[PDB]
Design a protein around this ligand. Structure first.
Ligand SMILES: [Cl-]
Ligand SMILES: [Cl-]
Lengths: 931, 139
């Protein structure tokens, strides 16, 4: 078995240099790949392993020199496989890619930082190896901006970072597989400890093999396209994995960094520096599977998960809190609680005596947590309970009061150090996570609210709210929100959809306010859209209404957005209802689908500028919600610069960002990764509030305004004006098969306009072409270079000195690293009509030209010249993804064309749809985020 | 029970059917599931107070000051309309809450339990229409 000598050689050719001297990435993936191929040989034979290894070697050679012969050599093997071998090979390359991902995460997590590699400017903040940690950000604010530590501390107290967990656009990886990946990363990391004994190392090797086999031997296709409740369960796994333990550890490090600049206080335990929100079970935009019952279910499930975690954590807390000296107030509470009926600690104590007063109070808290868990479970599984609401915690203050009593009491007696231990961690967990872990946002199209109001006005013989102008809509809505008479009853003709909308509001009214965040209006365009939701909320008897958040998607909607928000703030009722706070959402992917990516980027910078101007005019604290597709939605270090790049005063101590599902494992799967994620969000938010990016030079604004026009021209001329573009899109890409398959929901929700943004990005990401991300950049840069010889220099100045522009281009460059026009050409050759071949050829030429122009702008000769660690890891993954690409292409030809007969090969040792699904899930997991 | 009666008559057992079974059927028909049907009785003025608080809350005037013809006209527009009349956001005195709560309890119980809603001191058609409207708007 000298086969190992070959994969090592190929791996070393793929990743040649060393990005440091703790660079063990090739070692890691070589070990995992060797062990996997041995498992594969033992289960499916020697021939199967040899076939698979020949394929991988060819793929890696291709990612080296991109010789098209290597692609033809891959295809020759992949077409000759009967569906059984096709399934085994596809599964095999999926798991091989997963192992490359795990090795990459370990390498990232244990890479030593380099203080001497910092250049001293903001470019350092684009990579994890040079970004500023918490304390370096503190000292940068103290030295360069001459801010006093007390100002830094006061900024932190009132700062909030709000991370929003959304469903994965594909395989929301099951909780069990997350755990297996964790065990693999742990075995890997421990195997390279520079002190380990022979027997420990042998047992770790055997544990690693055992786990890799375990992951390879579980099916990941059948049953259902998981119900929204299941997807929510899988999405909540990261709280148990890292986030629950991670929040108090991070906050304590904030305390230590504050001590290292002279601050003696800690960050107050009730200060919400970190918050979590969820769309899982709340986003109904084009998703009929998300019903009123789904929302009720995930709300109660979240209350259960939280009560479970508090219940298990408070037993350790009860063992630690064995003091007897206490406050007079706490002693009074101990005597009161002792007069009652001790069922959840008989294994610990027969009963808690009054000479352990902290244990008395905490034991009663444990009892209330148990009743809350069992009660929410009874509500979920039936619809009623029998658990008195007074025996549980219904709001966060009931929970915090006795814990704070313990903290005050402990501090009274000089036991502050004891109080700053498990008790401080607990208080910070209650403040961060509340009774729900997450707050659920609800999202719905504006048109659905319009349908509801139209049925209402038609039922009252007043006209159709739909035909009314925006001004008449506003006038009627305003008369109703200010009036004293209810609007509608059961005697109302309701369609199925209208009943969905109203029932969602009724379920919101029947659940605790701690469970909900924002009501987000998709396709928001006018103030009447927001006022419709405020009115529907009020008339559905929602006592504590949700905050309404418009999502301005199309480009024209963004241009009209500050006008609409100003008109909203100018209405007296809405002004006094919002209580000085407004949240607006922007969708980078959504706007890019409308007008190309470069135009959407520059338009979103300008739109935030004007919205801040409005908020200052009316004295409102604005919160910008960054949807998916942004620079701030990337994985790792880049986010740090992206946050710093936002326009001045757009954050103001309140950051709300979508954590994309294709990135959540890279960000929260591992202990170190979790800490560093929380750290860069916190540090960048704090720094941006006190140190905005430079204001753009006037010529930069004018130049980008010009480029936006040319870029929208090219993008729309190809996507919307070319008649046969849609025909090509249906051939060169698995868009049709993606919706028809099983993943997500509905993609339409006519033409591309009705197509959702996620399938729009996905379809082209599968083919390694990425047209939605880069299209438009080429013609814009060509146009400005040709108009004036000097514009190139100006572009090169912007990329070097304007953070916004650098992050925009940097994201484009990263997407180009994951692109390969040769593979896209293979899709054309197999799946596209001949008379459409020049069309794709032209698009590929555009791909090439933009690439060179993007390089010229960034001052680079190769892609990602400034981030070799990412270039290295991407090359590693691409070697596995390429095989799944060729396999997916030929599998598509086999599905669509039963007249394409292939010379089959004999089956290799112990359904084309399953193959296709495997390749989609795999390629998606290897490319992760693009646009 | 009627199935038993029909069946017994089918087989020439009508005399058997005309015994304890006939007594039972006649007791079910006479007494129903309640023995009695409960009438509700209330002064007309109390309904007038409820409607007056409502119209005052909507800034339309005082139903009490209105002539009988104006009372009838407004009541008629409301019983024929499609929009509900009031909600929880309504200043209720103790007495007005008694009247409305009585209607709510009536709505939450089986119809076999109730007979007639009797208006004490009834004088005009608006007194009857007030009760019909309050009934309809209390669901
Ligand atoms: Cl469920
Ligand atoms: Cl005992």
């Amino acid at each position: 078995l000298e086969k190992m000598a070959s994969i090592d050689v190929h791996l070393r050719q793929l990743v040649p240099g060393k990005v440091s001297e703790d660079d063990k990435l090739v070692e890691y993936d070589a070990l995992l790949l060797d062990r996997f191929l041995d498992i594969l040989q033992d289960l499916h034979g020697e021939d199967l392993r040899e076939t698979v290894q020949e394929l991988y070697e060819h793929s890696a050679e291709y990612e080296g020199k991109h010789e098209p012969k290597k692609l033809e050599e891959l295809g020759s093997v992949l077409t000759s496989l009967d569906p059984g071998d096709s399934i085994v090979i596809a599964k095999a390359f999926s798991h091989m890619l997963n192992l490359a991902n795990l090795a990459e995460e370990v390498q990232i997590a244990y890479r030593r930082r380099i203080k001497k590699l910092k250049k001293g400017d903001f470019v350092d903040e684009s990579s994890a190896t040079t970004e500023s940690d918490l304390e370096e950000t503190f000292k940068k604010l103290v030295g360069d901006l001459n801010k006093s530590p007390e100002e830094i501390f006061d900024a932190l107290k009132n700062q909030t970072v709000d991370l929003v967990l959304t469903a994965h656009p594909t395989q929301s990886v099951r909780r069990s597989l997350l755990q297996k990946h964790g065990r693999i990363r742990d075995c890997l990391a421990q195997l390279y400890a520079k002190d380990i004994t022979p027997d420990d190392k042998q047992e770790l090797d055997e544990a690693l093999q055992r786990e890799i086999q375990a992951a390879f031997r579980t099916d990941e296709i059948k049953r259902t396209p998981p119900t929204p409740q299941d997807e929510m369960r899988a999405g909540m796994s990261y709280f148990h994995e890292t986030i629950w333990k991670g929040v108090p550890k991070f906050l304590r490090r904030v305390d230590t960094a504050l001590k290292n600049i002279g601050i003696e206080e800690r960050v107050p335990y009730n200060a919400p520096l970190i918050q979590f929100s969820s769309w899982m079970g709340g986003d109904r935009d084009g998703n009929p599977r998300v019903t009123p019952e789904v929302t009720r279910d995930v709300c109660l499930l979240a209350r259960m998960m939280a009560a479970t975690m508090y219940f298990n954590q408070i037993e350790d807390l009860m063992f630690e809190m064995s003091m007897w000296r206490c406050n007079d107030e706490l002693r009074a509470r101990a005597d009161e609680v002792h007069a009652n009926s001790a069922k959840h600690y008989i294994e610990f104590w027969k009963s808690i005596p009054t000479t352990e007063p902290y244990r008395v109070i905490l034991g009663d808290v444990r009892d209330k947590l148990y009743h809350t868990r069992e009660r929410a479970h009874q509500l979920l599984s039936n619809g009623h309970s029998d658990v008195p609401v007074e025996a549980t915690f219904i709001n966060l203050e009931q929970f915090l009061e006795p814990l704070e009593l313990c903290y005050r009491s402990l501090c009274s007696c000089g036991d502050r150090p004891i109080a700053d231990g498990s008790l401080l961690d607990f208080l910070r967990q209650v403040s961060t996570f509340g009774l729900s872990l997450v707050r659920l946002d609800i999202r719905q199209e504006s048109d659905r609210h319009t349908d509801v109001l139209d049925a209402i006005t038609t039922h009252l013989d007043i006209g159709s709210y739909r035909e009314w102008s925006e001004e008449r809509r506003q006038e009627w809505l305003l008369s109703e929100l200010s009036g004293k008479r209810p609007l509608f009853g059961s005697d109302l003709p309701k369609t199925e959809e209208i009943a969905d909308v109203l029932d969602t509001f009724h379920v919101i009214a029947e659940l605790p306010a701690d469970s909900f965040g924002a009501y987000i209006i998709s396709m928001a365009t006018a103030p009447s859209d927001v006022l419709a939701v405020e009115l529907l909320q009020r008339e559905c008897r929602v006592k504590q209404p949700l905050r309404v958040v418009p999502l301005f998607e199309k480009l024209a909607d963004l241009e009209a957005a500050p006008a609409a928000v100003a008109r909203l703030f100018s209405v007296d009722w809405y002004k006094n209802r919002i209580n000085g706070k407004q949240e607006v959402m922007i969708g980078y992917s959504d706007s890019g689908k409308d007008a190309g990516r470069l135009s959407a980027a520059w338009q979103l910078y300008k739109a935030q500028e004007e919205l801040v101007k409005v908020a200052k005019e009316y004295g409102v604290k604005l919160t910008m919600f960054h949807g998916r597709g942004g620079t701030v939605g990337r994985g790792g270090g880049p986010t740090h610069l992206a946050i710093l790049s936002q326009p001045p005063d757009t954050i103001n101590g309140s950051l709300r960002v979508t954590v994309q599902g294709e990135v959540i494992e890279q960000s929260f799967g591992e202990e170190h990764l979790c800490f560093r994620t929380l750290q860069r969000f916190t540090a960048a938010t704090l720094e941006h509030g006190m140190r905005p990016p430079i204001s753009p030079k006037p010529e930069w604004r004018a130049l980008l305004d010009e480029m936006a026009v040319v870029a929208t021209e090219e993008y729309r001329s190809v996507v919307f004006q070319e008649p046969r573009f849609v025909e090509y899109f249906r051939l060169a890409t698995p868009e049709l098969e993606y919706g028809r398959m099983n993943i997500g929901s509905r993609p339409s929700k006519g033409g591309i306009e009705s197509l959702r943004a996620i399938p729009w990005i996905f379809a082209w990401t599968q083919t390694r072409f990425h047209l939605p991300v880069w299209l438009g950049f080429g013609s814009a840069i060509r146009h400005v270079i040709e108009k004036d010889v000097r514009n190139l220099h100006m572009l090169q100045d912007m990329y070097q000195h304007w953070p916004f522009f650098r992050v925009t281009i940097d994201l484009i460059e990263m997407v180009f690293a994951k692109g390969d026009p040769g593979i896209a050409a293979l899709y054309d050759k197999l799946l596209v009509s001949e008379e459409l071949w020049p069309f794709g050829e032209k698009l590929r030429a555009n791909f090439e030209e933009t690439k060179k122009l993007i390089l010229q702008t960034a001052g680079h000769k190769d892609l990602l010249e400034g981030d070799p660690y990412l270039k290295q890891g991407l090359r590693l993954r691409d070697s596995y993804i390429t095989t799944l690409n060729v396999c997916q292409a030929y599998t598509l030809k086999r599905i669509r064309d039963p007249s394409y007969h292939v010379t089959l090969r004999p089956h290799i040792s112990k359904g084309l749809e399953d193959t296709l699904i495997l390749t989609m899930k795999g390629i998606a997991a290897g490319l992760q985020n693009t646009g």
